[PDB]
Design a protein around this ligand. Structure first.
Ligand code: ADP
Ligand code: ADP
Ligand code: ADP
Lengths: 723, 474
């Protein structure tokens, strides 16, 4: 197959010249690690880089930066010709000029602010005509290699010289910008980018394959999520990634025109795209155009919906287009749009979690220098309600908070502000802590869906149950064979019971982390909200999120809460059926038993639970988590205290036997009051970074047990009915 | 098309309804297929604006403007029968109605075969599993399910082949075969999402899946089978066939199996309404939906309509203690009503089932509603053998396992209690062959382990309290 041809691929490295190939791939090419290679891709041109040792990779394909992908005139999923060019060389002279648009509005020397920190100790293989890129000074500036020594064929070591005259060129139509959008710009999204990439991969990248084979690609694709989640940025990125003409319709745009002048604009929009195919028509706000369910008022609006429906199945053949629409809520759309052949494929782009927020923060801070104390983690870890567009504003505020501190007094009077100060201006943690004080913390608050952080090492004791959960969750996805062989059907769910505070909720988040599934937590007050509010129609809306977030574990916490509110043991004259738990059983039964969604209930009042939940096919397995034992109470106290570094004079295992029926909850504040004492005295005596036994034997006074003599045994009197 | 006619200008549309039909009159025999009718004429409350009302009235005129005119047909399609304007339904306009339901496992296989017939499946691929394992899909979801699995095979294999062609090669594409690993993936996608409503089908379970119950299998046959298959005598002697049956007894003993079995016996459709769907109508205060069930059962005839745990609403309000009120409530009331107005000469047949027969409303047991009480009790040692034989056909048990010894071990074990004894052994088995992975049989040491976990769900009084009931039936 001539296996010096590889597939291009994205890069996990940001480095301007680097290639990532694993240990085998450099070997079948028989080549070094620090080499200077050569890459001949489509459209006759080439460039040179430093390869690096890689691990993950794949069989054959080459992880590459967007900068080098752009010189070669290549795109992900195309193929490239590498042969080693070990021939070495050292610079005498370079001539590089930047382009006007990327430098516009700047003052003075270009070299020092960028080139001097840039070329140093890189020893990078310049080629002539190479457009590369450098970041700094709260922007990004482009540099091209104009006329050069032993052409093209160069390497930059201190013994080279550099010069730039100061007249920029005007870039032409043959090359594509790095000021446009690509997958690097997107963060907190991998799953959804994955899903979307191969829906649109073959039909865009290879249209003639479908002009042969009789398989039908998807046409409509519908994106979800609250505003500012990046929906427009994900569609525009993909379009500019594959190279398809990206046409953009806006909801208000079409609705602000005169009636019938608008009808022009829907119509002529699509065949405009049919003339340009492959093309992507991105409808900005669709629920502004076609929100028809009850809405349905006036002749004109109804007509514009019906117009769009006709255009969606008027896509018959017509070569290759895609229609990607974005909308806030899936339910505002007219269901006539959803029918097959129109918008069939749906993607849900959620709010980011702490893992992803860090990627977003890094993407928007990459053009500016943070101070040494600044760790984006704390900013990332401490904003729990933000969508992506809130972090883009959070980073812009902190930047100007640095200017309205510092350069405000500098009072540079410039029509073009100086380049040497702006670059030098660095942003501290004190700024981020301020921007987090502003109103951008305000952001949209709804169901959290993520992968829990807590691993088993945060759980003391509970040695049996950690296994039970593994065989209940892990096997039927990871060994589907046997359940076909022997024939049994995997259980749908588990019910934890026991005393309060002993770790029922931890076990749930732990098994989700164990298996890398999504964790959805529905807390008792959110069940009681549906009970008083008399809307149990929302239970159906939870499962349809859990279905869509699969693999998922759906954890109903204090499932006894509605039966307590109506009196429980005494209760009312009625029985144990109520309208929210009824609605769970229903949505539970209609759920696909062959999908990966897994349900965990938890209750500490198992006697008042409705017996209808415990039938086979709903929640089969009762598990009992009791008060921990002296072996475990050690593991608990060890586990909690990793946060604070305890001194060695503190004997926990003595404190263990001091605590008898202390639950995993009761021990946790014993650790926490000592953390009050400590922080107090170091402030108290401020006018020591350890914790001392005298703290604990103080907090000993305040130790309570929340579980009486009957409570512990009443649970046992229950489990004896389970013999 | 519905939108097609409604996207045009008002009065330019009126052209398009009119000239559409005589266009068909010039071509007769012709079929005019209206794509989405409830987009054109959804008039009941809808009724807003002068133009829309006019387009409904226009279509009505064209339907009885069909007088003679030679031969055409008008076939319209709509999602729900109730969205249409009832003025369209009147005789001479749309008189004939057909209900095309969602497919069942039997039919899904036909759909999958129809769309896979142009491509070669691998040898392991059996469309059955794909067919048997998609329980919510309509037909157009299986047409997408097959297209996904095809490209999942291309985005594995020929992706690397990187044939650069304006006309792709015929010799590779034909050679590309689709494995089960692809279907299992396409079933992981969102196409599993599909529309979920009343299941109407013919149950698979035959009598060979039911252990014991030798009398009742006959009783049901003479109650269902005769009056359709010998209408003569009931005219001769004159009696009227009973409309329905009520099973009662302890839980888990097979009341629900008998129902699906007699439906399979007679090849009728089986509609199951489960207790939580009755309690939904009770809390939600909409009992107007009971009428919507029967009109599905009427239309799905021959049908057996099976109300399961019919005691569920009387339990929710407290039952024995209850409230100060009596045994009438709004959902069971609405059943009696729709039950009476039903044609006694049609083939629809109603089966209730309850394990709390004492708290049931006495108004259901009058003649002409549910006449025949049948009692399914805890099985006997002869039957408990048949039960254990029946369940285990799924897994091939070894010969050292003596069930008939285990039979007498179980005394008041119901047909439900025995079923997980079989199932925990199926947990043990699958465990150890994974446990010791780092044997395709099941061994007695499994069972005598699972023996520890055997429970009976029926106490001393429970079994006899049912008997103290049946003695009032002497
Ligand atoms: N997930 C994300 N990753 C990176 N940047 C984002 C993300 N979401 C939003 N942004 C920033 O927010 C800005 C606006 O987002 P936008 O595409 O308008 O969201 P939507 O289209 O969903 O309203 C973009 O310029 C982008 O810089
Ligand atoms: N076994 C345990 N290991 C570690 N921490 C525990 C354990 N049991 C309880 N805790 C601590 O107790 C607190 C409350 O536990 P929780 O998960 O709420 O139990 P429950 O859900 O039964 O109330 C948690 O903050 C946790 O840190
Ligand atoms: N007589 C029987 N023959 C075969 N299986 C039975 C029998 N009785 C009970 N079972 C098993 O018990 C389970 C529950 O029975 P079910 O039909 O729900 O009874 P009920 O409706 O009275 O609860 C079924 O899965 C069935 O396999």
């Amino acid at each position: 197959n001539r296996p010096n041809r590889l597939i291009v691929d994205e890069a996990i490295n940001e480095d301007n010249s680097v290639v990532s190939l694993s240990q085998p791939k450099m070997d079948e090419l028989q080549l070094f690690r620090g080499d200077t290679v050569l890459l001949k891709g489509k459209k006759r041109r080439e460039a040179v880089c430093i390869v690096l040792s890689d691990d993950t990779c794949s069989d054959e394909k080459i992880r590459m930066n967007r900068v080098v992908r752009n010189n070669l005139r290549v795109r992900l999923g195309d193929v490239i010709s590498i042969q080693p060019c070990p021939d070495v060389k050292y610079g005498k002279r370079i001539h590089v000029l930047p382009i006007d648009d990327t430098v516009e509005g700047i003052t003075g020397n270009l070299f020092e602010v960028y080139l001097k920190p840039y070329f140093l100790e890189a020893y990078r293989p310049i080629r002539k005509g190479d457009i590369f890129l450098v970041r700094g000074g709260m922007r990004a500036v482009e540099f091209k290699v104009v006329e050069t020594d032993p052409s093209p064929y160069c390497i930059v070591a201190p013994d080279t010289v550099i010069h730039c005259e100061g007249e920029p060129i005007k870039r032409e139509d043959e090359e594509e910008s790095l000021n446009e959008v690509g997958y690097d710009d997107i963060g907190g999204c991998r799953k959804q980018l994955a899903q979307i990439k191969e829906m649109v991969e073959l039909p865009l990248r290879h249209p003639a394959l479908f002009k042969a084979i009789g398989v039908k690609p998807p046409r409509g694709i519908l994106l979800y999520g609250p505003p500012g989640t990046g929906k427009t940025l994900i569609a525009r990125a993909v379009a500019n990634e594959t190279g398809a003409f990206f046409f953009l319709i806006n909801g208000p745009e079409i609705m602000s025109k005169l009636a019938g002048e608008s009808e022009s604009n829907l119509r002529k929009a699509f065949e405009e795209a049919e003339k340009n195919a492959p093309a992507i028509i991105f409808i900005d706000e669709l629920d502004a155009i076609a929100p028809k369910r009850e809405k349905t008022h006036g002749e004109v609006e109804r007509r514009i919906v019906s117009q769009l429906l006709t255009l969606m199945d008027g896509l018959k053949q017509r070569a290759h287009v895609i229609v990607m629409a974005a909308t806030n809520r899936p339910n505002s759309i007219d269901p006539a749009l959803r029918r097959f052949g129109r918008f069939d494929r749906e993607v849900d782009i959620g709010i980011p979690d702490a893992t992803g927020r860090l990627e977003i923060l890094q993407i928007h801070t990459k053009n500016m220098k943070l101070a040494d104390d600044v760790d984006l983690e704390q900013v990332a870890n401490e904003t729990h309600g933000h969508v992506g567009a809130d972090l883009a504003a959070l980073c812009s505020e902190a930047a100007l908070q640095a200017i309205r501190k510092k350069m405000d007094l500098i009072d540079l009077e410039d029509e073009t502000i100086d380049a040497e100060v702006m670059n030098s201006l660095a942003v501290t943690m004190d700024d981020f802590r301020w921007a987090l004080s502003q109103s951008n913390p305000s952001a949209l608050r709804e169901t959290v869906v993520e992968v829990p952080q807590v691993t088993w090492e945060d759980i003391g004791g509970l040695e049996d149950v950690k296994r039970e959960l593994q065989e209940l969750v892990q096997y039927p996805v990871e060994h589907p064979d046997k359940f076909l062989k022997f024939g049994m059907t995997p259980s749908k769910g588990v019910l934890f019971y026991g005393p309060p505070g002993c770790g029922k909720t931890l076990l749930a988040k732990a098994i989700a982390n164990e298996c890398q599934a999504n964790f959805i937590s529905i807390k008792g007050p959110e069940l009681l909200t549906m009970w008083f509010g008399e809307s149990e129609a929302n239970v159906r809306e939870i499962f349809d999120k859990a279905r869509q977030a699969a693999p998922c574990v759906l954890f109903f916490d204090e499932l006894d809460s509605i039966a307590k509110a109506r009196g429980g043991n005494i209760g009312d004259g009625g029985g144990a059926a109520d309208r929210v738990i009824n609605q769970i059983l229903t949505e539970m039964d209609g759920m696909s038993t062959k999908k990966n969604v897994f349900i965990i209930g938890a209750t500490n009042r198992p006697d008042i639970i409705d017996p209808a939940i415990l039938r086979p096919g709903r929640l089969d397995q009762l598990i009992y988590i009791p008060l921990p034992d002296e072996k475990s109470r050690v593991a608990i106290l060890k586990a909690n205290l990793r946060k604070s570094p305890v001194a060695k004079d503190v004997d926990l295992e003595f404190l263990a036997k001091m605590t008898n029926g202390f639950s995993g909850a009761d021990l946790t504040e014993i650790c926490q009051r000592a953390c009050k004492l400590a922080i107090r005295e170091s402030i108290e005596s401020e006018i020591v970074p350890e914790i001392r036994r005298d703290h604990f034997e103080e907090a000993m006074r305040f130790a309570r047990r929340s579980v009486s003599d009957n409570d512990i045994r009443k649970y046992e009197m229950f489990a004896q009915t389970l013999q």
